[model samples]
Target: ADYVLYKDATKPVEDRVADLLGRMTLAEKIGQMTQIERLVATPDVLRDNFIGSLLSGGGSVPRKGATAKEWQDMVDGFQKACMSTRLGIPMIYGIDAVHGQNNVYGATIFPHNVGLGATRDPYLVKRIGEATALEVRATGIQYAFAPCIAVCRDPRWGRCYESYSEDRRIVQSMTELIPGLQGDVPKDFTSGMPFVAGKNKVAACAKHFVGDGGTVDGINENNTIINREGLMNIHMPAYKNAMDKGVSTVMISYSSWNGVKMHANQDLVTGYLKDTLKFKGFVISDWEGIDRITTPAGSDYSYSVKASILAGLDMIMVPNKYQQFISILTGHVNGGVIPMSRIDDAVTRILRVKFTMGLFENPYADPAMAEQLGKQEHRDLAREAARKSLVLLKNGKTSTDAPLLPLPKKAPKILVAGSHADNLGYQCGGWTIEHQGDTGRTTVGTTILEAVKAAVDPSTVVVFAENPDAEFVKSGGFSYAIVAVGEHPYTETKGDNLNLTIPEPGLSTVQAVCGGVRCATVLISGRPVVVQPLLAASDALVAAWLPGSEGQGVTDALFGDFGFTGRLPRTWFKSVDQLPMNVGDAHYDPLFRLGYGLTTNAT
Candidate 1:
């Protein structure tokens, strides 16, 4: 009976959704609201227990160095199990895929959001989104928790790099993303309604709903004290843009707004985001966000379950202890603590997305599509985004003359120094392999040093060193130097910084290389770090901002293959003391103002 209308591809999604919702048991409805992690997703567990959705949490793969086909096999196995459930309802598989299909080894990692923010090119961002969608689909994943529209107001925030810009206008401009991968919504698309274009496109999530980036002191999971006016004008703009562009889901933030945990705040989550803004798509919790709603933090799981559901969270990203969650929710429903209507609404929204995506029509992914992972054209698109995202902070000691970039590829000899010069992991930044990503050739990609070797004339000598000293710089007789340095990969709480200084040897190496010879410094960081102190030391500086896997783009700009068009995504502060400054602040004296970047033409 459930199969007749919902299975028919020709039926209107709303009609099909209502029919399916009316047919589902309470057990099935609750299961549809639950999302579990991949490691615990056994075939038996999913098939027997009516599991709804599964996710490959950051870097959670079948095995180390798992290929695209390997990922497809594992997901398909889980999907087959879910498909065998009594109703044959297909489950959606979600992954971070935040910067390319990052969990997979061979995927091309594009520039992170901060880098994209710097570019301020919606068309290019759209192209990157399409490339990302193709890569994600190749792994048989149907949803990506991406296009994070956080207007990061402070660099100290660990996840600031994940946001497009401190300015919501920039973030708003960037919202045309992911949906670009969602294959362009219909001309008559309603605001806040969710739709996924076709099989090749994956659904997108505009995440950490409302003011995650405005937390006090840029603290992760801290309080955001903005009033409703500032909230609507600043943090809320891009989300509206996101929904209008057909973003399928909005993930609730773990942060508090005016001392209220957002996950349990019905006024915003249900009243404002859902009712006032008319967001029709399902709302999801951050990974374990529901569990953290209580003051003791996960101590009162039962209350969290009750509060989060009633407060309007549709999907729970509960990775483990799911049986306990299901039991508590079932009890709550039976006891009238959460009305059946709430459960029905949640399940309806979830199924609407699945139906709109045509999961019922084509649930299992094309295994052959796995071959599209890191397709050369996608890598080239990534390379294009990379070149456009680099902001020229200091083209020369002067604003224009004595330019060190457009460096002589035919130079007699050059030295490439500093920690980031030869490292792929640092340039890829966080939310990369294994989360809080590590340094070294952690994934497949060229480093600035390697790219430098490739860019320079074959006859030119290129000496590479992680950290060169004054002696090496003076004695090596290098004509010029390229020093790549910045923050190591970090995520959430671990990536937080107070001093914001480039790590130890990178500082000394800059003093050594820049003072001894004319040099260009390439900083590979998620957000702006202390740069003024090193300003005088280097003849030129380029903010690479985590240009993933495509250091050739960085080399292209330095060697004048492309002009620099990127503007500063955030205010480059002089010190951490200027803690929360942005463009329009009364005391705004930034080292480099937001939107400030010197330009250069391709040679």
Candidate 2:
């Protein structure tokens, strides 16, 4: 054919999909459903296999200091290869821009989902989404695996920070992010339909399809033993909202329902999510999600191929083994184990998203968009988000006591203590520059110490110590101490902990500083750590949950610039024994209730 109907952007998407599906070979269709990591990707592989998608997992990047222009160049180079294919079908690039095109250096890193959840401001979340879209587009990527809508019921879950709240209502409200990332939901929008307005917009994925956050004991990928009612009540609400907002993709969770793998849950994945919910978006597998379906990961590759495909997984995040996956899937199709109809269904969904995103017509990244990266306006927004996310768990001696916060702007001397005070990486937490995320200035941003300095008078004396002894606190005659302490950076499986206690130096730093002088303790953490003992010793306590990139927001709340407005997104447990405790649990007794937060008047 001189030019296919699908090649014409003016045609309706359904007709275009039908035309393209008719021309594709079995290999080409399967390749369209395969997604690989950029590390193992080559131009020849993309062209030869007719690969439809590519992704950068957390920490995946071009170079240490790759600029927005360099990122655009690299992605466009890949697009050029895709355009050279026989059908010239463009590949969609994806990344865990979970927080503001985070993988790219100098891109504005907004607070993680947990922090944003504390703000409880859907409009603000929507604005963050808009900013995130522009930044991701600047890097030339067309898809973002973001706005992780998992409603965490347990604080011990390593990925709790990824969740917006423990309540499904909060997660449901935050679906405002979907419209922000893609485009506004059209008047004729329908549930289960893919929606992306134009080239300026990128496709958004509602992740971990069901119960990825409710695993027993807060274990990563463990069984979530809840009745159908609990599951529908807690975990399923947000997805309905996401679908209603016209999300383009839904990622299957790695966790299981009761004992059955979510990856292989044909009833939920195919029956409920795809069919019942009327979800028009393609269903994607988590990283190597199918491989782990058989237990030890890759234990039964052939079976995994059959099960996942039949279970309605449209896209496989093969990551590194695209050829192997393609070969296995091809064998399954040939053997008649996976029907040709299934293959067509998957391809149709994938093509629909590409068409809806207008990728065929505009495959290359807009290099001019690079100017939008790390814009000062975005940085200011991040600062505002951080400011509103700080929950005042404890302030001053008692409810009647004069609050120690909104500290004197012209203090003669201010002593700052704890490892996290001056550390940028510690505040930003995981899913940052790296997957598990690291510490010690991993990316550009102000630290709480820097923000504190900026908030004080130039003539004021500010002393810093990662771990100050009681002697220094007593001898210095400081006005008051600000001890920033909490968890080091972590993500997913690595972050789970039974103890949930503040590490030694952090606890000791609090004891030493608070014991010697009046002090305010800023807990910089992903979730609430055990701090009853520290809470007793400190005059004030603030939960500054992973306030990414902008430290000014923290100071704004702390130094009389802004009053404390954020409430607890997750409850602060008095002890780990309250393991899975949430707001409505039978025997709930928390140090801080679900919505508890102290407030102050701006001076």
Candidate 3:
């Protein structure tokens, strides 16, 4: 009966936003713009500061092996403090959740984007987004920093696996993931406005806007040198698709465009992304992204706040000293360094998203939904994703010769060798249990060897060795061998490899085992490696690009339980000399062209 328009669910989102915006004090407005890391947050900090949002960085959890219920309690505890505030606006919580609620233990980790790109199935990607959203919600989070639509033009980029493809069309198609994450918008919904269908779905982010993947030599956060047309045609289209799908937020890139730092580029951030593109959703800065605006990062903190906010960034992932950010931002408004209109605009965008997401009506986490984390169905979906993502680079030594795949399940004896065959950590690659991914059974999942053992006939003998020699294989009388090899887990800059060679003993194992027996070699990596150099050594070669938590998928395709349908999404270059190669380049030369794959019938 009271005139509380913001609390009424039936009210239009704009009306609710207006009511909340009018009620907000200067301190409240500044608080709404600052986002802090979970480690820095306390119940007192939240209520006293009115910090608008919270985020868990990669591998940041309540405790080791924290369950879904524990996550709920932690998040709800944060929410409980904020809801008791003067306005009671619910703060949005975000996490990477980039590849299937990745930061959570017991969650079904799915294939990285490079693997999904090989499937060429946008529907499958959408399904993954939906599954990810549910698992994230089960852990009591509302926003997922995912579906990175960067068009990776070069495999040298450490984050290439995060991109759908080098082709913009594939990246554009995968934007179906946004709707899957945010839930479908109705007919009346505005094109660029934020939308979260209900409590079950979470808001999605299209990140590192404007040529994060086109940086020179594919360096992390390096400069991207591209003309306007080159940028729009190759990298900009995906964000358009994301906005059309009602993506709730767009993250600013830490990388620069041409010679200018993107964090301070008002012309592009405001001129292109906001005014020209008409993106209604809030624009967010990446972690400490604004700090890097000056050389030596964080050198010019005061200037970064002014420039980034004026340049159209709505939320600052301060993951920082919140008091300083608030103090500085508040001073900007009071001293008129930043106009009141700018603060109003930023706060308005924040309120709009909050209202659209129905945060006011349902601010707290529901205890019952915690059961949705890591359900068997999600694992089955991960299995399907892994199965369709395996690209068969070489089926045999020669095309006319009989292929080596469809391994005999009833063989008297078989050998499984190489570092990755029995390791779940290597199979899942980066962003699993740890930020860079850890070694061993860091979480529950079937390894390639485990799946192979389960698939073979009961009478069949399966020998396992992580580093087998030629003598071991010859002496064992193994009917055939499966060698799984490739990179160990590394994320971001640590994953950047100039050599692109298959690492150490695993490469040696492939050489040792393949010569002694019929071999099917699986290269488990985030992107294509130097396979042509190793081609003739193995009878069959598989590009299993980071299949997460579902090694059965690799065996399913290998042993003819399922037909091979995956294709190469990125050009598998013959050598690193062809560094920036892609499909349409005039000098294009690749070991296997984009879209190339060998099809096999299930036995």
Can you give the lDDT of residue 307 in candidate 2? Answer: 91
What C-alpha lDDT does candidate 2 achieve relative to the native structure? Answer: 0.88
Can you rank all candidates by lDDT, best first?
2, 3, 1
- What lDDT score goes with residue 120 in model 1? 87
lDDT of 3 by residue, 1-603 (tens): 576887888999888888888888999998999999999999999999998999998888999999999999999999999998988878999999988888888888899999999999999989998999999999999999987988888787788889889988989999999988888888776577788888888988999887888857764556754778778789898888887788999898888886777877888888887787777778889999889888888898999999899888999999868888999998889999998888888889888888888777778787788888988888999999999999987888875878898887999999999999999999998888766787778787899999999899999999999998899998999999999999888766785666788789876898899989989999999898888656778989899999999889999999999989999999989888888899899998888899999989999
Worst 10 residues of 3 by lDDT: 216-225
Write one digit per residue (lDDT tens) for candidate 2, span 182-274. Answer: 989879878879999888888999999788878587746567547687789998989999989999999998888867888888999999998
- lDDT value, residue 217 of candidate 1: 73
lDDT of 1 by residue, 416-504 (tens): 99989998998898887775687888777888989999889998999998887788899998999999888988876786666788787
Error at 420, model 2, angstroms: 0.5
Which candidate has the highest lDDT of all?
A: 2
Show where candidate 2 strays beyond 4 Å: none
Q: What CA RMSD would you report for each candidate?
A: 1.4, 1.3, 1.2
